[PDB]
């Protein structure tokens, strides 16, 4: 039972499918060019499935607990990109 702290890498699993959120290597190529697509994959191997939490505003800092009402930004570990 880890508690989430700003700075950890989390594993988001789809409740229905049982598969994990990840940044897919392929992209829809709608002029994004330097961006990927976010989907689901079975395998947990690799850093694609992992996402790092970062604070939204200046009040929250790195290393403190994650609150229910707080906003956050997720960074893909493999593609260093944000959910956009």
């Amino acid at each position: 039972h880890r508690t989430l702290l700003y700075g950890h890498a989390i594993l988001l699993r789809h409740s229905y499918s049982g598969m994990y959120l990840c940044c897919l290597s392929t992209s829809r190529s709608s002029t994004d060019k330097l961006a990927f697509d976010v989907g689901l994959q079975e395998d947990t191997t690799g850093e694609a499935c992992w996402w790092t939490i970062h604070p939204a505003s200046k009040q929250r800092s790195e290393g403190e607990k994650v609150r229910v009402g707080d906003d956050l930004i997720l960074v893909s570990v493999s593609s260093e990109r944000y959910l956009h």
Binding site: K33, L34, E47, S78, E80
Partner: protein, 48 residues
């Protein structure tokens, strides 16, 4: 190194290889000898 692989992938995605090949394939403007036995030279600072 994961960081090195990531950076290489970023640069590869940013700059396609075909664009580099085409830009290299772009031709120059050769200096040309003309009448009176003198050369006309394209300007360095105003061209490729």
């Amino acid at each position: 190194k994961g960081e090195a692989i990531r950076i290489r992938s970023i640069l590869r995605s940013l700059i396609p290889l075909g664009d580099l090949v085409g830009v290299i394939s772009i031709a120059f403007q050769m200096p040309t000898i003309a009448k009176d036995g003198n050369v006309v030279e394209p300007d360095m600072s105003a061209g490729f």
